[PDB]
Structure 1
Amino acid sequence: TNHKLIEAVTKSQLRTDLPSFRPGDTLRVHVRIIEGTRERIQVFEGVVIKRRGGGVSETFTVRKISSGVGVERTFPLHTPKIEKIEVKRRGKVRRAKLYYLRSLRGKAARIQEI
């Protein structure tokens, strides 16, 4: 494990309501925008290109194409800022880090579905 004390003191930070997912899966991440006093949910939908780290430190990255410009959002996997995550599609890929997608566009960047 990680150091027992670190795990013990960070255990209550961990969320237990997250679905399983893998790089190459398409996610809809419902994110709480708390601008001012008004709070709303903005959905960021894209392919998971990266998952790294462990415990409360774990992060994941999702990539989308917006108005022709690639955008990548990285979240702490356990952030309370995420209302929920939906696994829209399961991808078929051959490696943990899909950095090669950054250089691909259009049909070249499509991920086969499982």
Structure 2
Amino acid sequence: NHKLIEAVTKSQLRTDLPSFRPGDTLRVHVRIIEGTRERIQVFEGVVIKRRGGGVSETFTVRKISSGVGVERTFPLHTPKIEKIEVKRRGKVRRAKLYYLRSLRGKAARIQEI
């Protein structure tokens, strides 16, 4: 980039994370503070959006919770994500999958590899 923005933002660029592409179903562990403890709550769904932009890149993972679909967007280098692990790998022919925001239950399936 400008090589002065980039030289300051390399301590805040946290790299210990696996590699993936859209069309994959992750399993996030976030660290909420809601409670007597400071518990760790999972989230499981399929990835829609990017992983690029620099030190500001964000992904997007959605699931069908209890009838009503939900989405979550995370900054990739937060201290709030504990770890990321992969369930299954797909083949989607796209880079951003917005067409799963209207498909019902057996049309929102993505094949494996």
Question: Which secondary structure does the structure 2 equivalent of 1:112 belong to?
Answer: coil
Q: Relative to structure 2, which stretch is displaced further, 98-107 or 51-60?
A: 51-60
Q: Does 2:81 match 1:82? A: yes
Q: Write 1 or 2 for the structure with the bigger share of helix.
A: 1
Offset at residue 36 of structure 1 (A) = 5.5
Q: Write 1 or 2 for the structure with the bigger share of strand.
A: 1
Offset at residue 37 of structure 1 (A) = 6.0
Report what 2:7 is aligned to: 8
Question: Which secondary structure does the structure 2 equivalent of 1:106 belong to?
Answer: coil
Structure 1: which 5+ runs fail to align?
Answer: none
Offset at residue 53 of structure 1 (A) = 3.6
Deviation string 1:49-83 (CA, Å, 9 cap, x unpaired) is 10154221000000100001110100001111100
**Percent identity for Structure 1 against Structure 2:** 100
Question: Which secondary structure does the structure 2 equivalent of 1:23 belong to?
Answer: coil
Task: Name the CA distance, whole Å, in 2 between partners of 1:84 and 1:52.
Answer: 16
Post-superposition, which runs of at least 4 consecutive aligned residues in structure 1 deviate over 6 A?
Answer: none
Task: Name the CA distance, whole Å, in 1 between partners of 2:53 and 2:10.
Answer: 12
Structure 1's 37 and 13: CA in aligned 2 closer, same or farther, altered over 3 A? farther
Offset at residue 17 of structure 1 (A) = 1.1
Question: Which secondary structure does the structure 2 equivalent of 1:78 belong to?
Answer: coil
Task: Name the CA distance, whole Å, in 2 between partners of 1:55 and 1:13.
Answer: 11
Offset at residue 92 of structure 1 (A) = 0.9
Report what 1:112 is aligned to: 111
Task: Name the CA distance, whole Å, in 1 between partners of 2:56 and 2:110.
Answer: 28
Structure 1's 56 and 36: CA in aligned 2 closer, same or farther, altered over 3 A? farther
TM-score, normalising length: structure 1 = 0.93
Report what 1:48 is aligned to: 47
Checking the alignment, whether the CA contact within 8 Å between 1:14 and 1:55 is kept in structure 2 is: no
Question: Which secondary structure does the structure 2 equivalent of 1:8 belong to?
Answer: helix
Q: Alignment RMSD, CA only? A: 1.2
Question: Which secondary structure does the structure 2 equivalent of 1:34 belong to?
Answer: coil
Number of matched pairs? 113
